Design a protein around this ligand. Structure first.
Ligand code: MG
Ligand code: MG
Length: 205
RNA sequence: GCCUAAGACAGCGGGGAGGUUGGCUUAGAAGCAGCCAUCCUUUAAAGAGUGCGUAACAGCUCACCCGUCGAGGC
């Protein structure tokens, strides 16, 4: 299909245009927060997104052109949704750059935790009612005090590792707690002769 | 004969945006009483909106795009 070629053409051509080739994940990012992130990184980095299949060869075809073996090897890391990123910036300040400008998002169900998850206590400030019942339902001591539910507790709710009930999840979406950081997260990257898994980036104090 | 392994049909997940509450009208008309208009931008993709819904908003969803799957579709 004619449009598919023209894409791959622009994909590759944008790939060798810069020294640092980055594979990032935008999955579960909201369109406004995206476009905000977008214009802070505008002049630095360039991005396009396509079917990950078009991108599975993509770079591999251009691994042929520049003649490198292991740049193709990064295509062996592709998951979820994917997009390509190109810049003159090596990863390490680039990673900070992505993780700093991220935003808090509410939590959804059937998901592990990035961090440990807790509550802001006492007055939740609405009318009393049904809302207190499911609060109890998972592990939450709560009473009523002037005008609505108080929560006395400070201790763990869910400790990381073990997952969260289809909703154990939100009293928090209802409480307005958005404990987790989302934005562009990195699948993997590297340029010259060496390749890393994203674990390495959190580290180096 | 056309599309389809460069990922079809269907289903499941995620997105479904900003200008903006388009303009006028109207007690009010925010995509969705009715008239006219029916463009730009940020884009992988998103109509000045396909069907519920509100008192009007909010909310649910659908065209469109991405993933998941993996052989048939007009
Ligand atoms: Mg209406
Ligand atoms: Mg547009």
């Amino acid at each position: 299909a004619p449009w598919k070629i023209e894409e791959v053409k622009t994909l590759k051509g944008l790939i060798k245009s810069k020294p640092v080739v980055a594979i990032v994940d935008m999955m579960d990012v909201p369109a406004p927060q995206l476009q905000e992130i977008r214009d802070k990184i505008r002049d630095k980095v360039k991005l396009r997104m396509s079917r990950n299949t078009l991108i599975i060869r993509a770079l591999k075809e251009a691994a042929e052109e520049l003649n490198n073996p292991k740049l193709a090897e990064l295509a062996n890391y592709v998951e979820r949704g994917a997009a390509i990123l190109v810049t003159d910036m090596n990863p390490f300040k680039l990673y900070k750059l992505l993780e700093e400008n991220k935003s808090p998002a509410p939590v959804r169900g059937g998901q592990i935790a990035p961090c440990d998850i807790k509550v802001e206590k006492g007055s939740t400030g609405m009318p009393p009612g049904p809302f207190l019942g499911e609060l109890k339902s998972v592990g939450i001591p709560a009473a009523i005090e002037k005008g609505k539910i108080a929560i006395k507790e400070d201790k763990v709710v869910v400790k990381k590792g073990e997952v969260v009930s289809p909703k154990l999840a939100a009293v928090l979406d209802r409480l307005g707690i958005k404990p987790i950081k989302v934005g562009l997260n990195i699948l993997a990257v590297y340029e010259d002769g060496i390749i890393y898994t994203p674990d390495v980036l959190k580290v180096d104090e």
